């Protein structure tokens, strides 16, 4: 399922992302846009066994388990398939685990590159009427 920009931003605000660990809402929409293009079903079969999953393109090497990434971790204790659900809640909760450990959103390359310097409050403008 591909979210509308404001559809997504609303949900991300209901999932408590607004300023979560120092990161305003537009940040989260900006990384979602530039990781998956708002599509909860986005995958990216990284060259080795690893695979980026869902709206925030979570990597199976570290966070979830697909059953195909030898000696990966599962730091969210979820199977990857759950990220592709079209609900963002699983993707959103594992992301909160990622931003606290201390990088934080730098953990997402698309955020690090396409969002860091931009004016990010623009990714949520016009979404209230
Ligand atoms: Cl913002
Ligand atoms: Na695995
Ligand atoms: Na979780």
Author numbering: 1 to 129
Sentences reproduced from the published study:
The resolution of this structure was 2.65 Å, crystal belongs to orthorhombic space group P212121 with unit cell dimensions: a = 31.4, b = 92.3 and c = 114.2 Å. High R-free and R-merge values may be due to anisotropic diffraction or radiation damage due to X-rays. Total 47 interactions including four H-bonds and 43 non-bonded contacts were present between ten residues of Chain A and five residues of Chain B at the interface. Chain A residues: Asn77, Asn93 and Ala82 were involved in H-bonding with Arg112, Lys116 and Arg114 of chain B, respectively. Chain B was also weakly associated with Chain C through interaction between seven residues of Chain B and nine residues of Chain C. Analysis provided that there are three H-bonds between Arg73 and Gly102 residues of Chain B and Gly49, Arg68 and Arg73 of Chain C, respectively, besides 28 non-bonded interactions between these two chains. Further, we also observed that in the trimeric arrangement, chain C interacts with most of the residues which form the active site pocket of chain B. This interaction implies that if such an intermediate occurs in solution, it should reduce the bactericidal activity of this protein.
Out of the different protein candidates one can use for gaining atomic scale insight into the pre-amyloid state, we opted for lysozyme because its well-characterized monomeric globular form at low pH associates into β-amyloids upon heating. Results showed that upon increasing temperature, lysozyme molecules associate and loss of secondary structure as proposed earlier appears to occur after this initial step. Our experiments conclude that prior to loss of native structural content, low order associations occur when lysozyme is exposed to higher temperatures.
